[PDB]
Amino acid sequence: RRGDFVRNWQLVAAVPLFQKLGPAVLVEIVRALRARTVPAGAVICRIGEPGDRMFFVVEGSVSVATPNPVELGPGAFFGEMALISGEPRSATVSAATTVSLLSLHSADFQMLCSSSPEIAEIFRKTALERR
Template identity: 40%
Template sequence: IHRRDFVVTWSMVARVPLFADLNAHEIGTVMQCLRSRSCRPGEVIVRKGEEAHSMYLIASGDVEVVLPGEHVRLGPGDFFGEMAILRRRRRSATVKASTHCRLLVLDADDLHELLEANPSIAAHLHNVAQARGSRKSS
């Protein structure tokens, strides 16, 4: 598959709410770990039940999390794919691009290092994963 990559800039990373408390040096470090991935509308980014190797931050565009009975839309500044990495499980849901998307991809090893160095990011990520995981569709 040929994907048109884009350059991950410092300001793109600095705009991600999850990284809001990092200083300039730390943002630079995170930036070096991030890869870019562009997706076309409808493209499946992660598939329920698959093994997980990375999590994703949305730089632009919208994605849809396919849950029983509902689709949850996530947009710029949001992230997904954290649950399987944190819990060392398989993907809990399929996530697909609703629009053309630019994603920042963080591999599991780099994420674990980032979380060790930044307890407040770790706490936030765990809280979000917990809330998402315990949410029942009505």
């Protein structure tokens, strides 16, 4: 899908994390990432459910329903904890505003992790801080 591919470049530009990727790995993730828009209030992922993908916020913000809610703005990522640990979602995440998201399925996530050990590390430490 070509339309999806060329649109992904401007969306990927919104996520500073990918500034750490060379051209080849950028193409891989720009191929792998799916763009979606989530209306305000809508559940993106639900506590206790299985997680097969992780998300990057392009525009808007999400709300992690931890006892003290966590707002995540553009460039932020979530959903990595279930991918790393294999456990169900630890928290519900909803669109706080209408949200533009990029999602990464599990296989592509592991491919990004081997393709970039620096980014693997960031997901790793971030998931540790969050749990």
